[PDB]
Amino acid sequence: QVQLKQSGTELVRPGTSVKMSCKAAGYTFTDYWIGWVKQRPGHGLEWIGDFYPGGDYTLYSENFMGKASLTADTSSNTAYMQLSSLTSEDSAIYYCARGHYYGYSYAWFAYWGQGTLVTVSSASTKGPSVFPLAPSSKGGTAALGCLVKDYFPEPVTVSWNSGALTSGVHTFPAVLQSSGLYSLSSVVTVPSSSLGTQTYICNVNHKPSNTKVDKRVEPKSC
Amino acid sequence: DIVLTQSPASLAVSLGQRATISCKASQSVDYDGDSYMNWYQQKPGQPPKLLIYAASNLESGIPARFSGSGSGTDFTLNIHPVGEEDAATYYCQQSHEDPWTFGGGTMLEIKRTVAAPSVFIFPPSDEQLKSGTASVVCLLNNFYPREAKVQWKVDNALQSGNSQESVTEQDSKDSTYSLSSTLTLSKADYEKHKVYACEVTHQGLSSPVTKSFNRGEC
């Protein structure tokens, strides 16, 4: 199967450059263009440029001339994009995608990487604390959760019971607090009758800080 | 550049019915009998997904509920019958000449029956109170439509400026939303008051619902 796998989340300082990667599998890497696309809230999708590994051909948007540089390493099936002179306007999710020939164009992007989130900031990485949202002692359905507080940069992911509990789970979009740090909650609704017999653990991952927390959420015995 | 204008910017369509999204290009995208216009779907946390290429070709694996039409400068994406899983943002994109350009996007809301929220309040944890800050959380679970009012009251005094809300994307299985509101106080201020209450107003509720606790009473 055609697959594109991108490198991890970045936190990089203003004025510097960042170089991210897109590793391809499942097809002849030198035979297809790789396109790069920027996604920033409030600005939809914006194309940056294309790279052809079988020859090192480039095509850029005029808005990224002198800002983006596309390269590849055919020995590892890896395409790269470097963004220079970074500012807060460059904080965004960046995707790679593979084009294919139909008619007389290749800009039909059927296969996409999962995206690389880039935050441009001089502030330090801070992994979160994780606090329980304990099921109330005062029915048929109870709600419980985990509060993931005071982290930077995005993102955080949460699972429950190592991925075994998915029904009724709501993991909320993070909020940027006025401290400049993010917070998010993840909740699940479950049968109140299961509270004394079923264990509930939220699995919190903040990869930028390598913070991995497994927090057991138990009813408060009062 | 070929500028793409989508309309509407946001659309609510009844479950089971037809959603139609328009994309108009500033110049023709036709060549040799093909129209170089594509359509993508995107949900939060995921990359865009190709639905339709060259105006009317259904991408392999995409349900035939999706179809595309048009030529020249005027194109439409049609979804019929709409299902819960179609809640997403949709984009057109032209492949005729560089730069490759996208429309601004259209958010599709799936209109379902009214559903009142189930409301829950959570006191700050003892673990957090060791740190000098108190977060009080009010949860509104699985409601529709999206509009909802959450008011915090501390000892019956209405709070302002010290809470933040987060709302989920529309659920891909039941078309509801959920909402969290977090009230943040210093530990010092939290211990100066007793009654913490979240009051919720929503179309599905005949009268506001209040959930509350008394600090320390557990």
Numbering used by the authors:
A (entry chain A): 1 to 52, 52A, 53 to 82, 82A, 82B, 82C, 83 to 100, 100A, ...
B (entry chain B): 1 to 27, 27A, 27B, 27C, 27D, 28 to 214
What's written in the study?
CD4 binding induces rearrangements in Env trimer, resulting in a CD4-induced (CD4i) open Env conformation. For comparison, we also structurally characterized CG10, a CD4i antibody isolated from a gp120-sCD4-immunized mouse that was developed to characterize conformational rearrangements of gp120 associated with receptor binding.
To compare sCD4 requirements for V2i and CD4i antibodies that recognize Env trimers, we solved a 4.1-Å cryo-EM structure of CG10 complexed with sCD4 and the clade B B41 SOSIP and a 1.4-Å crystal structure of CG10 Fab that was fit into the CG10-B41-sCD4 density. The crystal structure of unbound CG10 Fab showed ordered complementarity-determining regions (CDRs) on both the antibody heavy and light chains. V2i antibodies elicited during natural HIV-1 infection that exhibited CD4i antibody characteristics were compared to CG10, a CD4i antibody that was elicited in a mouse immunized with a gp120-sCD4 complex.
